[PDB]
């Protein structure tokens, strides 16, 4: 492990690279084995966070804040890694999360398993590129087999039971499985409310995921509208407004002010009195314009002053101030209103409508929130999460993100493979059959790919207390005997091994992305044979 070790065949200094004495290098099979060791360490860390009986990890950051989670992407992001192959595995999980939002632990476990099998193949002397090419071949076979055994679900708003089952499968492994169906239902309703069916797009900016300590997890609900962390501007305004005609404004309720450098010169008592009357009349004109539009509520983005606040109160115009741009946008979208930049441009048509605007309390806290709901056809939505601690609230947020991403993936492609390791077992069977029909030296690489695909069912069995090899062999034999690629691991011990009957459901895009990403990253890792670093 050194950059250059000669110093010359003549005794004269041999300096080629800067700080070559402080620099290191690993070349060849030892570099490959170091990579495999790092990847195996990461994967063996992650495999215990896989499945319903999977356990969580408690991450502590630089400043000592605690994060309890089962999400592989969050774990590997919070993990203070120094190894570059482990950094690649963190990138792998992040990529699975970006593209899919689920599978972030399966990808890592599977990639680690592929590298662990490549280890024995390299011991037997196969070229790492030949291993990578056999892995590509087997991965293509497995992807087509997934397309083959896939099923389809209806993504309609009438019967949402298949989507609820998919979301429940996604949320089975998370701490929020205490409110399993409630969480699944609200993730489904959220995406279906905010989803472009024709475009097949789902903008998550239209889903506001808010958390507030207090209450119970069961109190988490879907608001068809908006929630804001603000209150009415005056403490004597009413805390409830029903059938609210809302004026959304990005103009501070203050006297106008040019953006250009300006100096208004007062040169006489008459000029001073004119200025005074101008200010008074500006405040009165603002409030009068808001009133003549017919609004019963105003929502500004930039705060206002004492005269405007008291005039709103006097004129029976409850008002919120210092509302942020994103929530202003969501309020406009939800209430059907248009964002107005100045009072002169305000009309009865630019107003939004909410059947209820309320200020909500949270016990012995002094904190208030504003709920806007009972809109007609809100294309925006809010998920308000409650719970007994900020750790379970943050975990609920990320778990519900997983469920929303899964429903998004169904809206993008409704095809569905059955989980519990059943899809992996079926793909392993297909890859084994094709390796049997393959006469080149990659037969070994494809057999290794199959043995690696079989690590997810083994991991599920282990986490569920079952004997990995026994359970997997029995369910594999059953799959080959009675043709049913929906036969998998009974993690919850419902008796049956039929995942189609247990309604354990994954997205085809999810499994395909797992396989493809794991294989591509394993390829880039096997292609590395030299490490240099200080």
């Amino acid at each position, epitope marked *: 492990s050194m950059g250059t070790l000669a110093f010359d065949e003549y005794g004269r200094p041999f300096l080629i690279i800067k700080d070559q004495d402080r620099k290191s290098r690993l070349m060849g099979l030892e570099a490959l084995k170091s990579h495999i060791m790092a990847a195996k360490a990461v994967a063996n860390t992650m495999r215990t966070s896989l499945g319903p009986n999977g356990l969580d990890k408690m991450m502590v950051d630089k400043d000592g804040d605690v994060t309890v989670t089962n999400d592989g992407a969050t774990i590997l992001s919070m993990m203070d890694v120094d190894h570059q192959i482990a950094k690649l595995m963190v990138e792998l999980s992040k990529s699975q999360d970006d593209e899919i939002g689920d599978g972030t632990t399966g990808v890592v476990v599977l990639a680690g398993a592929l590298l662990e099998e490549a280890e024995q193949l390299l011991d037997r002397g196969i070229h790492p590129i030949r291993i990578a090419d056999g892995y590509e071949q087997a991965a293509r076979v497995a992807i087509e087999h997934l397309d*083959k055994i896939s099923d389809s679900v209806l993504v309609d708003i009438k019967d949402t039971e298949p989507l609820i089952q998919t979301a429940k499968t996604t949320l089975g492994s998370k701490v929020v499985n205490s409110c399993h169906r409630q969480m699944a239902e609200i993730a489904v309703n959220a995406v279906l409310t905010v989803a472009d069916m024709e475009r097949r797009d789902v903008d998550f900016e239209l889903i506001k995921v808010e958390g507030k300590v207090g209450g119970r997890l069961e109190d988490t609900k879907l608001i068809k509208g908006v929630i804001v962390d603000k209150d009415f501007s005056h403490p004597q305004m009413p805390k409830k407004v029903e059938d609210a005609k809302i004026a959304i404004l990005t103009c501070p309720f203050e006297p106008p002010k040019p953006k250009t450098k300006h100096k208004l010169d007062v040169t006489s008592v008459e000029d001073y009195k004119a200025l005074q009357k101008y200010e008074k009349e500006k405040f009165e004109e603002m409030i009068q314009q808001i009133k003549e539009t017919g609004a019963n509520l105003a929502i500004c983005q930039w705060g206002f002053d004492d005269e405007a606040n008291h005039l709103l109160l006097q004129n029976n115009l409850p008002a919120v101030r210092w509302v942020g741009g994103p929530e202003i946008e969501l309020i406009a979208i939800a209430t059907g209103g248009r964002i107005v930049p100045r009072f002169s441009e305000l009309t009865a048509e630019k107003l939004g409508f909410a059947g209820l605007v309320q200020e909500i309390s949270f016990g012995t806290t002094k904190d208030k929130m504003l709920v806007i709901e009972q809109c007609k056809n809100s294309r925006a939505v809010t998920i308000f999460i409650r719970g007994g601690n900020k750790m379970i609230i943050e975990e609920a947020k990320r778990s519900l993100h997983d469920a929303l991403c899964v429903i998004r993936n169904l809206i993008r492609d409704n095809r569905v493979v059955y989980g519990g390791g059943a899809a992996e077992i079926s793909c392993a069977l297909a890859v084994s059959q094709e390796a049997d029909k393959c006469p080149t030296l990659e037969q070994y690489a494809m057999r290794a790919f199959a043995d690696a695909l079989e690590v997810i069912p083994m991991a599920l069995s282990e986490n569920s207390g079952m004997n990995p090899i026994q359970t997997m062999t029995e369910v594999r034999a059953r799959q080959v005997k009675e043709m049913n690629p929906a036969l998998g691991i009974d993690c919850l011990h419902k008796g049956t091994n039929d995942m189609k009957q247990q309604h354990v459901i994954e997205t085809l895009i999810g499994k395909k992305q797992q396989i493809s990403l794991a294989t591509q990253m394993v390829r880039m890792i096997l292609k590395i044979d030299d490490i240099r670093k200080p």
Partner: nanobody
Amino acid sequence: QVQLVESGSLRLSCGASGTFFRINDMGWYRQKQRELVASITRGGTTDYADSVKGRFTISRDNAKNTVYLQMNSLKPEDTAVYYCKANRNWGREWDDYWGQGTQV
């Protein structure tokens, strides 16, 4: 996707090939408004029809996912077009695959 071939006493066969992973049930139909002569499941369980039953020897070869119908007691009213149906994969309504039918 699924290519289906078809080949007093007679025997008519129907065999399936193509893209699939399971043929859940195989049935014989006759074409009048279409009816099912008989049908057999993977577990061998066969249910016959009402206007003709008990003289049927429909047998299923799982090794090649094909079926064989042995009919005796021939009659002029058995003279029609015989269609076979094969439920493949998960058994959804878009999984029933018909043959072109054999006119006797």
